[PDB]
Symmetry: C5
């Protein structure tokens, strides 16, 4: 054992610059974002508002975190306060994200970071048809609040898992389909393009 | 690269004095304030209260932040906790501003600062006529809480985009017009003048 | 001589926020004035009000003073860098929700002005709220832990309209705001605690 | 003046160890606990829940705080963050204590500490009979969460003042009697005894 | 030899709260036991419960140990000075509201006993709550970020009654509480994560 977990964590806390985006060769930090829906708690077809629980699965690389793990543990759990974390925000959120879980990320000796908080949050989106067979399709847009496409690129995750694997069987609602579209948007507010992942939650009230 | 992003951020955090208004020449800090409405969530015509979501687009100059970017990135995102930010408050707010987004501002190498939080907040204003064709006109006044007109001037941005560019299509309400104008008010409390931007939100319930 | 950065640096390095600025063993004179902005919710059954007010607080702290003959004579300072009086409303039934930036204004002679906008609920007399005479809700504000030899609490000068800053859009209207200074000795402690009692006479609009 | 208030507070701030229980001679710290009821805000006889405002009058001795006051002030107010405070909890509380008042205690030059926060808190207790002449009797148990009887002893106080001395005349309810009594309980979780003060609030809806 | 001041000073100076106390590359054995205190609100339509429980948590951290042959063998330490397991209820729909002082008990051999009283809301099976058989609500608690080689989670051996500490004033009553140990592999992740599944069998009182 070259570096034990105490040495690894000590090195990360002393030298991780949480305010510094881990950019490489002036390429954007590639952030992967995938929502795994856990619950749909409250739906209002009149106001077009949903209250939803989801895992915001977030991965990226930060090579300033890397260590030689040939004779050491190759992974540690790190408080996010000690790490740079992408400034992701859901564009159509109408409440502050309530993080339900310990605020720790997993860091791998090659600098990959995985962070997957469970968030409860309310959204403004299309709720029409929720009580039909076709269901409603609520779209959630997540992207960097302040980093444009040359600094943060945002891409949807890789595909092997079912959409309902994590979803509560006790919810009043059921998931029909979940698709993760990718957008690069240039707005009037700002000259640069901002990338987002658009998650389409097709869901319906159980019969 | 002369200064990479780590160097820029290091220099800012070591020398930015967040308590210190960046007044130059004994001229006021010119603060630009523009509200971009995102949603109108709840309206009560009996109590004259609205619950609204808006981007509080705030720009100002802080020369102590400037760096030589001839061979360096000319922009970085910085936690507002490392910067002086204007002490702006909505005068007719009846709840604490709920900041929905990451608390980062964008700083340009010439010292210009761009801070645009998405805020949910409740306001006491005129809701009468909300369910008519003319609609209601809700006025929100935003100014510095403690800096008078010789220290902070407050001005509405030049208005280029439509008032609904970022407004939710799923809101029960629609925006008819938004106008911004500045005031300089002497109050009886204090002998100086305090500047504000008055935002008039003309809106109505959809038919 | 001193720019704002120097003044704020000096204050931040030498202001002792835990230390009451008593001088000659006289009480710190704290002026308290409530300016009502809104009355949000009223319940005549439970005798509870929800209100928005500016808690205008002034006092002197000479350890803050600087020579301003060739310098700015005022700066805004985070209250975290300043001693602030431990004032509490005796009949509050919620924590004070401070709506505004936590900054005070400090003048070069050491006079501090702190005026947070606060939303807070109170237990008080709501009876008669829907009559012409209105209800009279009394709010008592005093130092939680400093007795009259350490903090004296005085109502400021009433100079303006009592509805000067009151919302025209409130369901309610203000008939009169009066501010008075009581001097009480309670069964807890052989010494005296000062408070300002604010009487808010208000009614539902017709 | 030998030590002014600045010197006293400086000395306390520098040497008070707020994480260290002030045992002497391996005797328990004697903590006095007395509730003074200010208001009864909400009562539910169906759920057996009450919402109450009370002063939690707490006194104890901490000799590491003492100073020579022969020529100095014999009392100061001190942020509780600079003092050790007893880890008291109400056993049947169903909400976190909402502390309404500034978080300062009073310290006397002999090391006697008095801390009296005004607390709003909800309780699970017997609400039956609330709307009868006999009234309801709601019992609240307060003791140390983690210190057993050899480390903290908890005792009530003396009935100098009436039970409704500070109780709101504007409450929907009235206090008939308060009794505060000492308990020492050995539970099954833990081989030690934990002391508590059990406050019995006899109260009724006004007629 | 060491008074409580010395013990706490040594812990505060050397306890590394971000460092998991793995030994010989064996997992930290974390014991988890829920003691239900109250069931506050139940909704059979939404399948949601609001519950108060003691989250009794124990583990060993030998970097906390001290020689207690002539010293106190136990102290209470703020959790902020200790490593605590990153436990999370998988079906919680609200943040855990910790009702109690955030202190743990540390024994001189390095055993930590942390038992917060927690109010939390859960999504689980509420059907049958108003029948004699009652509802069975299952709550799963495991480490959020540590797999089975780093943290093992096990139900504690508990002689004490299910209702030992449950409120007699609750609208509900407890019929049975079982605890059960799982280990799962999810698609997201190569490794296995351990949890304790607590089955709360409960019903509305008649
Ligand atoms: C990693 O460390 C080991 C020494 O334990 C060494 O064998 C190897 O060279 C290192 N790999 C590098 C430097 O990439
Ligand atoms: C910026 O730096 C360059 C060298 O990188 C220098 O030539 C130029 O004078 C600098 N700008 C200033 C100090 O105005
Ligand atoms: C303030 O500074 C001025 C100018 O330097 C000086 O005349 C005066 O002595 C100072 N005030 C005092 C302490 O008398
Ligand atoms: C307290 O201080 C006075 C002198 O200021 C001294 O006479 C007395 O001895 C001191 N108390 C003791 C015994 O520590
Ligand atoms: C604890 O101290 C005692 C003597 O006070 C000693 O016998 C022993 O070496 C110490 N710790 C161990 C290794 O058990
Ligand atoms: N999980
Ligand atoms: N995870």
């Amino acid at each position: 054992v070259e570096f034990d977990r105490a040495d690894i964590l000590y090195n990360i806390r002393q030298t991780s610059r949480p305010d510094v985006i881990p950019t490489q060769r002036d390429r954007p930090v590639a952030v992967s974002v995938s929502l795994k829906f856990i619950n749909i708690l409250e739906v209002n077809e009149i106001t077009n508002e949903v209250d939803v629980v989801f895992w915001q699965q977030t991965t990226w690389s930060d090579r300033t975190l890397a260590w030689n793990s040939s004779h050491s543990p190759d992974q540690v759990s790190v408080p996010i306060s000690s790490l740079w974390v992408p400034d992701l925000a859901a564009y159509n959120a109408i409440s502050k994200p309530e993080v339900l879980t310990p605020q720790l990320a997993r860091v791998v000796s090659d600098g990959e970071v995985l962070y997957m908080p469970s968030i409860r949050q309310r959204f403004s989106c299309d709720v029409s048809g929720v009580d039909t067979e076709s269901g409603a399709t609520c779209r959630i847009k997540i992207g960097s609040w302040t980093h444009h496409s040359r600094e943060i690129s945002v891409d949807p995750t890789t595909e092997n898992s079912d959409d309902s694997e994590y979803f509560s069987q006790y919810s009043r609602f059921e998931i029909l389909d979940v698709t993760q579209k990718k957008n690069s948007v240039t707005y009037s507010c700002c000259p640069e393009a901002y990338e987002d992942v658009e998650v389409s939650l097709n869901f319906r009230k159980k019969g």
